[PDB]
């Protein structure tokens, strides 16, 4: 497909535009943002000081 990228926006295609093909879409939901970050990841290891349970 001929296009003009200078506009800052480019028309999206599938193999269907230039060749004899068919679209091959299949649904999935793991690419939603909320789903993607809704899992735990670590930020580091921490410690407690001696006898902090009963002092300043």
């Amino acid at each position: 497909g001929v296009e003009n990228a200078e506009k800052g926006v480019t028309e999206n295609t599938d193999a269907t535009a230039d060749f004899v093909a068919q679209p091959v879409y299949l649904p999935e939901n793991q690419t939603k943002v909320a789903f993607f970050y809704d899992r735990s990841s670590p930020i580091g290891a921490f410690a407690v000081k001696s006898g902090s349970l009963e002092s300043g």
């Binding site: 497909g1 001929v2 296009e3 003009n4 480019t10 028309e11 295609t13 535009a17 230039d18």
Partner: protein, 58 residues
């Protein structure tokens, strides 16, 4: 009138063959028929409308 011919039978050769063909021309001209037969080369795709279009420059 007519000449010197006095045969009963229909002329065996038809007229366009037995005689010349008197034609008449009109003063103001005459339009050629549109087509002389059906032989032709063709130009296709000459124009537009339809493609992977309007991504195409203005």
């Amino acid at each position: 009138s007519e000449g010197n011919e006095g045969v009963i039978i229909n002329n065996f050769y038809s007229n366009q063959y037995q005689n010349s063909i008197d034609l008449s021309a009109n003063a103001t001209g005459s339009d050629p028929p549109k087509t002389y037969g059906q032989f032709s080369n063709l130009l296709s795709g000459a124009v537009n409308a339809f493609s992977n279009m309007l991504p195409l420059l203005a």
